[PDB]
């Protein structure tokens, strides 16, 4: 293994190279080498770092001095050190004989020069210096030719990669010059890394108290900045003493970012810090990530990599631009590969313990430096000054990790001030230019800010290691799909935005989902009274207050989230923007901006519509009407003809809702998805108002979704005739709702349980609505051991006023068990697959390894569950949802790539597939075809054989691995139902 | 303003630290800014000149003098003396000194008068006189005056010059007293005492040794961290000295850095598992630093040696073997002899002290680090705070609480360290206390002890004491000195039995805390999370209640362990308990950890080291006192109780011989350990051939049923009141509490008929033991929740009584007792209502009520509203005035008993004295009570309040109403005052 000391010393040496403090790295290395025990901790790569850093400052003498230390340690110089030495020799410009002698010494060891250069990664400047040194010597350069980017030879991906002649790739509507200007704006945003957005909430005319509060907030922040600068200087001096002593220090890490940048960033953190508060460890991780991102941006700027990125990006923009024409159309990643932009050396992050130590130091400096009076400076500096941040321990013992809470007075000051400027990170806001193509897992999305492929922080290092272990050829399909999802252009709808802004400014609406303001919140009417003075009653009053304040606290968190989302929507209202997409561990694609994203809320779904415009065509108007009926949720069981007829019947309501959403009949409010229903009525009204519906262009996406996507995968895997009919895989004239059947089975179980002693069924009698059973089914299948999913089922039960909330906790558990039995009964295949997957997972977890599998697309997925070793219950429960999530992601990526060959704009939000109304029919045919192709491959057998290779061939526990082999061998038998029927089924997605 | 005070305190500390160039850096910056020059006060200039005189640098002092000249205010007499002091050091010419005297004479009084007017240090006054001597004008030093004596009739007999005085002399020889003084001096210089823990020490396990080694490494790591943080803060503060801002650097310099580091560690040891308030800790840290600083300053000056010589001369008077020709009071002896006066006795200003304490506390919290020391990982990668701040519900208020982490607590328990560190003030003195010549200086010789133990109202009360004539203070000071002079020895037998029970569980009835402190609760609760949301919350609340109840026992265990630790440390050594005065004036023992007032067990342990023979009546008194401790036959006469003692004598002897394995009759008694000790003293008496020959060290307690009620019944002379409280002579003693219980019972019957069900809850549970505390809360409690909590605690002890309505029952009980008192006694109500109305009106005006006792020591109520508090002053005044009268009566009794030679101390109502002395003490205390009420206290109170508040221009109309209220004093009743002398049941 590798001990922690090497992972701190290596980080310190590399960091000291990036800060031009080589005399200090030399000092520390001298002290370390001098002590025998510390010399053991010193590794060859650290020496290959110190020498390389000296080898850029043009110092050959110190290089040979460190070489005396390398020989003294007994290490043998590797390919890296020889190359650093050759790169240093050229700078001194000594005669070619020395270079030839170095080549002779290299020849004595088992090493070459071209092979050594290929094997060991080097910077472009240093590689050029080495090459120039070799050119000075007698040997010619003799550079081997490059390797043309390979393509995936998987049966699923051979269509997209083999271009042939059937290519109709899409091109962005915006002209090339507009894309370049947008890129320059995004580049400016990335450089400053702070986006200032006007607060959407209406600003009242400032009162005298409000003005005073703003002057207080300005004075305080300035005092906090001076204090932060002083604290940073003191910490830097102490850490420099640690450098001279010979112990690992964070002094270069502090040096990498400018002092003013550190101070301003900490102040920005305080503004972003919610009233609720944030965990200290999370805050430290966030601070370290911000420091690393701003350092990567600064390093790229000083190196000149940014300018090369601009030229390469402009050439890449020519492909996307409609006006510019490229002779051979190719996928965006492939085009970027043809340009050959150089992946940055600094893209890789620091080691995780060092990052934690740095972030904790920044948070500790912030709390100690910032002090404000509880009295808020109303008395003349008589009241004690107390730190703004307060460490809070949930458990008194030092074993529980403490968290951080903002000052109560500071929160009040923030409210009273009502500042209109909102500070956002560059990563947080959506990109103003098309995202950088995902050439590699590590490098993609935001151009200047590194975005790792895995958004999840749990198990991040392991999954990334698997990503690099996997051949790049396999990864490319997922990377191409992610690039395609990023390339889609989004424009904020003006009308929907205006209506939500209206409601948001004053009161809001709960049914619509516009969060209520603090004034609306149920504040307690009176404080403890003389009659209530009894300590029992006072304690009860404090508990009710704790509940009321908890509800108010949640409402503030929801309104603040809505405020940020609508402020970004207003900011990006007139400007076309691109949402980059990132992959979780399960492989589901999630948009990188947290604050503004379509998945997060229904209102966000309504706001977002495609900037690119495609005409409706003959069937587009009908698809819009069918979409409108789907959003209401009326006649879901009824076929698409009945839905269209209902749309014609309710057309008068549709038009009236479009003309007046607020003062109208408000039929859209009655619909299950109100804002999306309103947007669809404001597109159908525009279509009918236009003389030709086919001529009219529908920006708004149309969403097609299976009732449960996991159930359809399970049904496909087992080929169950009953299962296919239930989830609509089998063609039918009338679609069958899979949730209704689960509800009926839960109802018969409820009747049986009512006869039994248990009263939970009696409590739930008449309240087991179909929507609750749908959320429960999704929680059971997609969600694994989730407190939030169970809280969501509980939330659905709470929404029903008639249902008593005294037994909501056990009613939710009962619903989870009854659904888990219902599905297992109705679906013969699903239970067998789930049981086999769980049994295999538990056996792998017990042996001490985490379950690892490769998706049919090719990207490896590893469960990140860690018992403080794999967690037996979590891994065994986690494997069926994660496997079916990986299958759903693979099907979505296949659908996306094939729809990109035909030119359709495709994005995926949860189960729903979003595309233009004209494109819907083609997208439906493509997704049925891809689903059939995905399940045509023997998914279960491939998984069984990969698990056998990964874990069954284990010396440590052969017998348990033998039992695992026996359970893996008994794969479920395919049923009578034909796979090809899925293509013919128009109700597979609807 | 406050800042000027802060800068002045900084200047005084700077002179002692000798950082005068640093003071000159601050002074020039302060003069340069016009506003800062206005902030500078004349005294700041005088200070630095005195320091420059010690240094000898004449030109800086001349610069300060010119700076005074530039300011334009008159040059003060304090500065001229400092200039002369400087001139003396470098051997300057006398003629210039005579010119300096001419400047001193100008705009000032004459050379003698100017010297008298301005206070100076012992070196300073000598230097000023020596500088005066060289000049042609004569020094003309004023003649001294003999110490004044009070002319008040009550204290006239005490101060009478007739040679009837027979002051008691301590049994210990003079040489032994000097050795004890040397031991006390060694304790004072060290300032800390190490005592072996009474609790049994188990053989250390491997885990226990590992925890001890870890604790040692942590405490030395803490000392390194504190020393480095202290140096860094000192450097920053020195940079603030140059910036001219307020700095705490000289304060930190006055105490040695090693001493400060060790003080911080001692405070961590003092902090308990529950935790202590941060502001209180800051005050305690500043007080400890001031005490150590005063000890160091006295040591370096050489005042300590003069104190030793003067105190040995004082010791000769107390010593039996040494003979003094003229008997004098202990204060009077010191006044006649040369008296060392320490200028540094006066404390630092309170806001600066708060700032210094906060700085020390912050340094303590950030410097120290504890990681819990994972034994197997041993990796320092976690937040490491020894102390954690809690919101405690009120976050806007931002009250500061500092509590140690449970990990520390578990480690301290695992190590089971025997050594315990106590402050010198905390432990009882090993030598007789210093005589109370002045209010500010008394009690501990090296550690300053102010008269006012209370921190609330401390400033105002001390100012009133200084305003008060010295002789009136002197009478109370003489009484306090007499109480301190009493010698206490720990009874070995009682302590042994307590230690054995303390080691092994003990007994709740005996008050012994329980070491296990376990409470049935699911230990792991539910291993899977949330078996049921309600049940989880229920168990969490139940575990929280168990944690609180267990913490109660831990605090009681620590208090008892500390008590016995001190009792063991002082078991073989005679010690003296100093006594101070609260705002009311009811004297209190200075040592907090070990005191007789604190617990009954301490009362049992403590017996007089000085020994007086029983005499003919001593055995009878001891038997009577045994009956008093049990509390049986209280109604029955003093002869019947004696007969009962003869009846139960076999049980008495058996219990003394075998307390643990005997009939345990003592445990059944109301005061068990006291009963056991008295049974061992009666057994020792009967074992001896002559009981009169036998010497009884044990005190005998004479206590009135209610001291306050007797005062009330005496002031109004109501016949019914006097008969109930035993002032009227009776053959069968009448108990006031029994009558109150009967009246409460009839009110309970009336309320039971009414809709209110509180009476039904209390039916059959209003026992006299409970009704007694309520009377004490009405008569002595001053809007105190804690006394009402004591009533609730008494209700909880009865298992049958439901605790669901205990709070309402306590409120009902206090109201009914209050409403039983007024109807039972007309005089008590007539006086209480008048006092409650007068205080209310004075509180409305905006002045706190101030009144002078018949002895003459002023008493001021300290209650404040964040101005006087309306709901506090009116309730507070009847008990505070009664407490002042009770204190006056006890002081008069103490002084007259001292004249006779009886050893007298007072613990609450209970008067403690030797068994032979009891009869004489009884007669003396009846005589003093009659004399105290012979003076018209109500009229004197009314006249003094008229002088203090009625002559107010601001609100004359309210003052007129107050004048009318004061004029209507309650009329004297038919009952004769002289009857109290004839009544043998006043105290019993």
UniProtKB/Swiss-Prot annotation, chain A:
Query: The organism sits in which domain of life?
Result: Eukaryota
Give the EC number(s) under which this enzyme is classified: 2.7.7.6
Q: Which EC class is the enzyme in?
A: transferase
Q: What mutagenesis or variant effect is reported for residue 33 to D?
A: In COXPD55; results in mild reduction of transcription of mitochondrial DNA in an in vitro assay
Gene Ontology terms: cellular component: mitochondrial DNA-directed RNA polymerase complex; mitochondrial matrix; mitochondrial nucleoid; mitochondrion; protein-containing complex
* Annotated catalytic residues: 705, 774, 911
Where is this chain compositionally biased, Pro residues type? 515-527
What are the protein's UniProt keywords?
A: Disease variant, DNA-directed RNA polymerase, Mitochondrion, Nucleotidyltransferase, Primary mitochondrial disease, Transcription, Transferase, Transit peptide
Ranges for region Mediates interaction with TEFM: 585-990
Parts forming coiled coils: none
Quaternary structure, per UniProt, is: Homodimer. Component of the mitochondrial transcription initiation complex, composed at least of TFB2M, TFAM and POLRMT. In this complex TFAM recruits POLRMT to the promoter whereas TFB2M induces structural changes in POLRMT to enable promoter opening and trapping of the DNA non-template strand. Upon metabolic stress, forms a complex composed of FOXO3, SIRT3 and mitochondrial RNA polymerase POLRMT; the complex is recruited to mtDNA in a SIRT3-dependent manner. Also forms a complex composed of FOXO3, SIRT3, TFAM and POLRMT.
Task: Give the family this protein belongs to, as stated in its UniProt record.
Answer: Belongs to the phage and mitochondrial RNA polymerase family.
Protein name (Swiss-Prot/TrEMBL): DNA-directed RNA polymerase, mitochondrial
Q: Which organism is it from?
A: Homo sapiens
- Taxonomic classification, please? Eukaryota, Metazoa, Chordata, Craniata, Vertebrata
Q: Which gene encodes it?
A: POLRMT
């Amino acid at each position: 293994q590798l001990s922690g000391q090497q992972q701190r010393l290596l980080a310190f040496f590399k960091c000291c190279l990036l800060t031009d403090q080589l005399p200090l790295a030399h000092h520390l290395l001298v002290v370390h080498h001098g002590q025998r025990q510390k010399r053991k901790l010193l590794t060859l790569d650290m020496y290959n770092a110190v020498m390389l850093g000296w080898a850029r400052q043009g110092a050959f003498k110190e290089l040979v001095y460190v070489l005396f230390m390398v020989k003294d340690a007994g290490l043998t110089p590797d390919l890296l050190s020889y190359a650093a030495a050759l790169q240093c020799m050229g700078r001194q410009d000594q005669d070619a004989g020395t270079i030839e002698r170095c080549l002779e010494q290299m020849s004595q060891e088992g090493l070459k020069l071209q092979a050594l250069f290929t094997a060991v990664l080097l910077s472009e400047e240093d590689r050029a210096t080495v090459l120039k040194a070799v050119h000075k010597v007698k040997p010619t350069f003799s550079l081997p030719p490059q390797l043309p980017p390979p393509v995936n030879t998987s049966k699923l991906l051979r269509d997209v990669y083999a271009k042939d002649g059937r290519v109709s790739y899409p091109k962005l509507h915006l002209p090339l010059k507009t894309l370049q200007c947008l890129f320059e704006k995004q580049l400016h945003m990335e450089l400053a890394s702070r986006v200032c957005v006007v607060s959407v909430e209406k600003p009242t005319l400032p009162s005298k108290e409000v003005k005073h509060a703003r002057k207080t907030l300005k004075t305080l922040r300035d005092q906090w900045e001076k204090a932060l600068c002083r604290a940073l200087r003191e910490t830097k001096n102490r850490l420099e003493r640690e450098v001279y002593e010979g112990r690992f220090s964070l002094y270069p890490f502090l040096c990498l970012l400018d002092e003013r940048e550190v101070v301003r960033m900490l102040l920005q953190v305080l503004q972003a810090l919610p009233a609720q508060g944030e965990s200290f460890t999370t805050l430290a991780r966030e601070l370290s990530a911000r420091t690393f991102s701003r350092h990567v941006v600064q390093r790229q700027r000083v190196s000149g990599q940014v300018q090369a990125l601009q030229n390469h990006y402009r050439k890449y923009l020519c492909l996307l631009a409609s006006d510019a024409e490229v002779p051979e159309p190719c996928l965006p990643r492939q085009y970027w590969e043809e340009l050959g932009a150089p992946e940055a050396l600094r893209e890789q992050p620091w080691p995780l313990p060092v990052q934690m130590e740095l972030g904790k130091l920044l948070a500790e400096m912030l709390v100690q430096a910032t002090q404000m009076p509880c009295s808020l400076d109303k008395p003349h500096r008589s009241s004690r000054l107390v730190p703004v941040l307060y460490h809070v321990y949930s458990f008194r013992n030092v074993q529980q990790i403490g968290i951080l809470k903002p000052h109560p007075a500071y929160v009040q000051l923030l409210e009273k001030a009502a500042e209109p400027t909102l500070t956002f990170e560059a990563v947080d806001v959506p990109m103003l230019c098309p995202p950088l193509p995902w050439t590699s897992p590590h490098s993609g999305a935001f151009l200047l800010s590194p975005t790792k492929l895995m958004r999840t922080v749990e198990g991040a290092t392991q999954h990334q290691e698997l990503l690099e272990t996997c051949p790049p050829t396999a990864l490319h399909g997922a990377l191409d799909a992610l690039t395609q999802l990023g390339n889609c252009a989004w424009r904020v709808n003006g009308r929907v935005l205006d209506l939500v802004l209206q409601l948001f400014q004053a009161k809001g609406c709960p049914q619509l989902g516009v969060p209520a303001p603090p004034s609306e919140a149920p504040q307690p009417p009176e404080a403890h009274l003389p009659h209530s003075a009894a300590p029992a009653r006072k304690a009860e009053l404090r508990r009710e207050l704790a509940h009321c304040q908890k509800v108010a606290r949640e409402m503030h968190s929801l309104r603040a989230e809505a405020l940020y989302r609508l402020s970004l929507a207003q900011h990006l209202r007139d400007r076309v923007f691109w949402l980059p997409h990132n992959m979780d561990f399960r492989g589901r694609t999630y948009p990188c901006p947290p604050h503004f994203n379509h998945l997060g809320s229904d209102v966000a779904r309504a706001l977002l519509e495609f900037a690119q415009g495609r005409p409706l065509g003959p069937h587009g108007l009908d698809w819009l009407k069918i979409h409108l009926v789907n959003l209401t949720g009326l006649k879901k069981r009824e076929p698409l003809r009945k839905r269209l007829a209902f749309a014609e019947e309710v057309m008068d309501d549709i038009l009236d809702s479009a003309d007046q959403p607020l003062t109208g009949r408000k039929w859209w409010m009655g619909a299950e998805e109100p804002w999306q229903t309103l947007a669809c009525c404001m597109e159908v009204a525009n279509a009918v108002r236009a003389s030709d519906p086919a001529a009219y262009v529908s920006h708004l996406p149309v969403h097609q979704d299976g009732s449960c996507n996991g159930l359809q995968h399970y049904a496909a895997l087992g080929r169950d005739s009953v299962g296919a009919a239930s989830v609509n895989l089998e063609p039918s004239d009338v679609p069958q709702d899979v949730y209704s059947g689960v509800a009926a089975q839960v109802e018969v179980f409820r009747r049986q349980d009512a006869q039994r002693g248990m009263r939970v069924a009696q409590v739930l009698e008449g309240f087991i609505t179909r929507k609750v059973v749908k959320q429960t089914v999704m929680t059971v299948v997609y969600g694994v051991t989730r407190y939030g999913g169970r809280l969501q089922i509980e939330k659905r039960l709470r929404e029903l006023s008639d249902f008593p909330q005294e037994f909501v906790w056990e009613a939710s558990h009962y619903l989870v068990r009854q659904v888990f039995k219902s599905l297992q009964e109705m679906f013969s295949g699903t239970r067998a697959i789930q049981h086999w997957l769980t049994e295999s997972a538990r056996l792998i977890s017990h042996m001490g390894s985490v379950v690892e599998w490769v998706t049919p697309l090719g990207v490896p997925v590893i469960q990140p569950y860690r018992l403080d070793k794999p967690n037996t219950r979590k891994q065994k429960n986690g494997f069926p949802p994660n496997f079916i999530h990986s299958l759903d992601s693979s099907h979505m990526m296949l659908t996306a790539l094939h729809c990109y060959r035909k030119g359709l704009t495709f994005v995926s939000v949860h189960d729903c597939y979003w595309t233009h109304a004209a494109d819907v029919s083609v997208m439906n045919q493509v997704c049925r075809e891809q689903f059939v192709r995905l399940h045509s491959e023997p998914i279960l057998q491939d998984l069984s054989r990969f698990l056998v290779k990964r874990f069954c061939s284990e010396p440590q526990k052969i017998l348990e691995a033998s039992q695992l082999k026996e359970t893996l061998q008994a794969v479920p038998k395919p049923g009578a139902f034909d796979l090809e029927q899925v293509k013919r089924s128009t109700y597979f997605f609807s």
